[PDB]
Design an enzyme around this catalytic site. Structure first.
Site, PDB file in Angstrom:
ATOM      1  N   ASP A   1     -77.160  -2.479 -14.583  1.00  0.00           N
ATOM      2  CA  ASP A   1     -78.283  -3.431 -14.596  1.00  0.00           C
ATOM      3  C   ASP A   1     -79.244  -3.141 -15.746  1.00  0.00           C
ATOM      4  O   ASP A   1     -80.443  -3.249 -15.572  1.00  0.00           O
ATOM      5  CB  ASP A   1     -79.062  -3.372 -13.273  1.00  0.00           C
ATOM      6  CG  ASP A   1     -80.033  -4.551 -13.091  1.00  0.00           C
ATOM      7  OD1 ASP A   1     -79.782  -5.644 -13.639  1.00  0.00           O
ATOM      8  OD2 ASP A   1     -81.048  -4.387 -12.371  1.00  0.00           O
TER       9      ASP A   1
ATOM     10  N   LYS B   1     -80.750  -4.463 -18.073  1.00  0.00           N
ATOM     11  CA  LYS B   1     -81.534  -5.497 -18.713  1.00  0.00           C
ATOM     12  C   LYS B   1     -82.857  -4.904 -19.200  1.00  0.00           C
ATOM     13  O   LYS B   1     -83.313  -3.875 -18.690  1.00  0.00           O
ATOM     14  CB  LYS B   1     -81.738  -6.697 -17.781  1.00  0.00           C
ATOM     15  CG  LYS B   1     -82.131  -6.386 -16.359  1.00  0.00           C
ATOM     16  CD  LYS B   1     -81.815  -7.583 -15.486  1.00  0.00           C
ATOM     17  CE  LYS B   1     -82.320  -7.406 -14.061  1.00  0.00           C
ATOM     18  NZ  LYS B   1     -81.686  -8.379 -13.118  1.00  0.00           N
TER      19      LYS B   1
ATOM     20  N   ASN C   1     -86.148  -3.602 -17.292  1.00  0.00           N
ATOM     21  CA  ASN C   1     -86.063  -2.293 -16.645  1.00  0.00           C
ATOM     22  C   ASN C   1     -86.338  -1.133 -17.605  1.00  0.00           C
ATOM     23  O   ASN C   1     -86.333   0.026 -17.202  1.00  0.00           O
ATOM     24  CB  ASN C   1     -84.679  -2.104 -16.037  1.00  0.00           C
ATOM     25  CG  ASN C   1     -84.445  -2.983 -14.820  1.00  0.00           C
ATOM     26  OD1 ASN C   1     -85.367  -3.295 -14.071  1.00  0.00           O
ATOM     27  ND2 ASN C   1     -83.203  -3.385 -14.622  1.00  0.00           N
TER      28      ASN C   1
ATOM     29  N   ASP D   1     -85.217   1.553 -13.241  1.00  0.00           N
ATOM     30  CA  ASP D   1     -84.768   1.101 -11.916  1.00  0.00           C
ATOM     31  C   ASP D   1     -83.655   1.922 -11.216  1.00  0.00           C
ATOM     32  O   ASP D   1     -83.962   2.783 -10.357  1.00  0.00           O
ATOM     33  CB  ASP D   1     -84.402  -0.382 -11.894  1.00  0.00           C
ATOM     34  CG  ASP D   1     -84.382  -0.920 -10.485  1.00  0.00           C
ATOM     35  OD1 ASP D   1     -83.508  -1.744 -10.125  1.00  0.00           O
ATOM     36  OD2 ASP D   1     -85.254  -0.463  -9.720  1.00  0.00           O
TER      37      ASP D   1
ATOM     38  N   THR E   1     -60.885  15.615 -14.263  1.00  0.00           N
ATOM     39  CA  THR E   1     -60.040  14.568 -13.704  1.00  0.00           C
ATOM     40  C   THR E   1     -59.065  15.063 -12.628  1.00  0.00           C
ATOM     41  O   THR E   1     -58.382  14.261 -11.994  1.00  0.00           O
ATOM     42  CB  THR E   1     -59.228  13.898 -14.831  1.00  0.00           C
ATOM     43  OG1 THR E   1     -58.772  14.899 -15.751  1.00  0.00           O
ATOM     44  CG2 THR E   1     -60.087  12.909 -15.591  1.00  0.00           C
TER      45      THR E   1
HETATM   46  C1  28D Z   1     -89.976  -1.736  -9.686  1.00  0.00           C
HETATM   47  C2  28D Z   1     -88.549  -1.528 -10.129  1.00  0.00           C
HETATM   48  C3  28D Z   1     -87.601  -2.294  -9.272  1.00  0.00           C
HETATM   49  N1  28D Z   1     -86.880  -2.855  -8.594  1.00  0.00           N
HETATM   50  N2  28D Z   1     -88.370  -1.906 -11.516  1.00  0.00           N
HETATM   51  C4  28D Z   1     -88.325  -1.007 -12.587  1.00  0.00           C
HETATM   52  N3  28D Z   1     -88.168  -1.738 -13.713  1.00  0.00           N
HETATM   53  C5  28D Z   1     -88.130  -3.069 -13.343  1.00  0.00           C
HETATM   54  N4  28D Z   1     -88.258  -3.157 -11.971  1.00  0.00           N
HETATM   55  C6  28D Z   1     -90.762  -0.660 -10.359  1.00  0.00           C
HETATM   56  C7  28D Z   1     -90.507   0.665 -10.004  1.00  0.00           C
HETATM   57  C8  28D Z   1     -91.208   1.706 -10.624  1.00  0.00           C
HETATM   58  C9  28D Z   1     -92.150   1.389 -11.595  1.00  0.00           C
HETATM   59  N5  28D Z   1     -92.988   2.187 -12.362  1.00  0.00           N
HETATM   60  N6  28D Z   1     -93.741   1.487 -13.184  1.00  0.00           N
HETATM   61  C10 28D Z   1     -93.419   0.200 -12.968  1.00  0.00           C
HETATM   62  C11 28D Z   1     -94.022  -0.987 -13.693  1.00  0.00           C
HETATM   63  C12 28D Z   1     -93.136  -2.134 -14.054  1.00  0.00           C
HETATM   64  C13 28D Z   1     -93.661  -3.219 -14.720  1.00  0.00           C
HETATM   65  O1  28D Z   1     -92.819  -4.260 -15.040  1.00  0.00           O
HETATM   66  C14 28D Z   1     -92.931  -5.426 -14.301  1.00  0.00           C
HETATM   67  C15 28D Z   1     -95.130  -3.260 -15.076  1.00  0.00           C
HETATM   68  O2  28D Z   1     -95.627  -4.371 -15.750  1.00  0.00           O
HETATM   69  C16 28D Z   1     -95.372  -4.530 -17.112  1.00  0.00           C
HETATM   70  C17 28D Z   1     -95.940  -2.195 -14.733  1.00  0.00           C
HETATM   71  O3  28D Z   1     -97.287  -2.154 -15.038  1.00  0.00           O
HETATM   72  C18 28D Z   1     -98.202  -2.069 -14.019  1.00  0.00           C
HETATM   73  C19 28D Z   1     -95.351  -1.003 -14.009  1.00  0.00           C
HETATM   74  C20 28D Z   1     -92.388   0.050 -11.951  1.00  0.00           C
HETATM   75  C21 28D Z   1     -91.699  -0.991 -11.344  1.00  0.00           C
END
Ligand code: 28D
Ligand code: NA
Length: 298
Positions: free
Chosen positions: A125, A127, A130, A147, A167
């Site tokens: 995943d 993308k 993440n 993620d 292996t």
């Molecule tokens: C949520 C996961 C899931 N499922 N994830 C990671 N990457 C995309 N989605 C998540 C888990 C741990 C995390 N630590 N920091 C963040 C975080 C992500 C994002 O992206 C939407 C932010 O906004 C840009 C952000 O800023 C507050 C923190 C996070 C997400």
């Protein structure tokens, strides 16, 4: 014993959920900020994800696990909180961003992946949404893959943790060929990130409205523009790496290791330092990424 809420209080959603949600949270003890992924045990099992974070989280460019709870119904995974935003998003809004820069960012990210593959881990995943910057220093070492909700650790039929190096235990063939698919697929995701990096637009989608059928069509035929328009000032060595990272046959496609042995990565100092000419429509690229991967997952 101790409960998640006992030591933490929830806050806004920071997005991106499947059978799970991510919320900002404050450690109501030390007042520090973290993230928390709340998973529904009745909808998916988080065990294979949580272990990966436990064994591998130590990597500077893998998101760091701070804590985890289970109230028998949900699992709460307290992690580092990203404050630098989504990596691609920040990169595309820099008008002064050159190839030397793009090669460093990719170096850092492929190095993380290569290690993960050496430990029989595939992401599945990878993308852009993440990958994030943990802070605003804009430094490659502040990059983080964040993620793992789909990663898989290679295991023998016997249940044994396997690395691609050892292996001598029995692993089913379809599981092995697939571990080569999922690894190649990771590399293809990186190639998509690189493509969008260099030009400011994605290889197989123009925006969020593209039909799932035309996007899939572009993918199935390989064949993606690598010359003209925003490719003029882009070096040859970069175009070469891109083609081999997006190679339509998973088998001829490059490995994480080989990518890192590519002259675009190794001889990064040769790379042009002048700004890249790119489309500047970061929100459109956002739509197009989501349209591409949606057409991949459904
Ligand atoms: C949520 C996961 C899931 N499922 N994830 C990671 N990457 C995309 N989605 C998540 C888990 C741990 C995390 N630590 N920091 C963040 C975080 C992500 C994002 O992206 C939407 C932010 O906004 C840009 C952000 O800023 C507050 C923190 C996070 C997400
Ligand atoms: Na880490």
């Amino acid at each position: 014993s101790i409960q998640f809420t006992d030591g933490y209080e929830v806050k806004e959603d920071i997005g991106v959920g499947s059978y799970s949600v991510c919320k900002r949270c404050i450690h109501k003890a030390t007042n520090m900020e973290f993230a928390v992924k709340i998973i529904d045990k009745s909808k998916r099992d988080p065990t294979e994800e949580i272990e990966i974070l436990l064994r591998y989280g130590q990597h500077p460019n893998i998101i760091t696990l701070k804590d985890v709870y289970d109230d028998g119904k949900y699992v709460y995974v307290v992690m580092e909180l990203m404050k630098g935003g989504e990596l691609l998003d920040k990169i595309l809004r820099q008008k002064f961003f050159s190839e030397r820069e793009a090669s460093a960012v990719l170096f850092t990210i492929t190095k993380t992946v290569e290690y993960l593959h050496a430990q029989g881990v595939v992401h599945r995943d990878l993308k852009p949404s993440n990958i994030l910057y943990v802070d605003e220093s804009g430094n490659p070492e502040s990059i983080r893959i964040c993620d793992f909700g789909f990663a898989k650790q290679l295991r023998a039929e016997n249940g044994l943790l396997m690395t691609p190096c050892y292996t001598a235990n029995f692993v089913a063939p379809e599981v092995l060929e697939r571990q080569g698919y999922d690894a190649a697929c990771d590399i293809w995701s990186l190639g998509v990130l690189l493509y969008t990096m260099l030009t400011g637009y994605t290889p197989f989608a123009n925006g969020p409205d593209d039909t799932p059928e035309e996007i899939l069509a572009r993918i199935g035929s390989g064949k993606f523009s690598l010359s003209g328009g925003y490719w003029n000032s882009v070096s040859d060595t970069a175009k070469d790496l891109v083609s081999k990272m997006l190679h339509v046959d998973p088998h001829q496609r490059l490995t994480a290791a080989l990518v890192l042995r590519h002259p675009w990565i190794v001889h990064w100092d040769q790379l042009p330092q002048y700004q890249l000419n790119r489309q500047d429509a970061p929100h459109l690229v956002k739509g197009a990424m989501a349209a591409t991967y949606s057409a991949l997952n459904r």
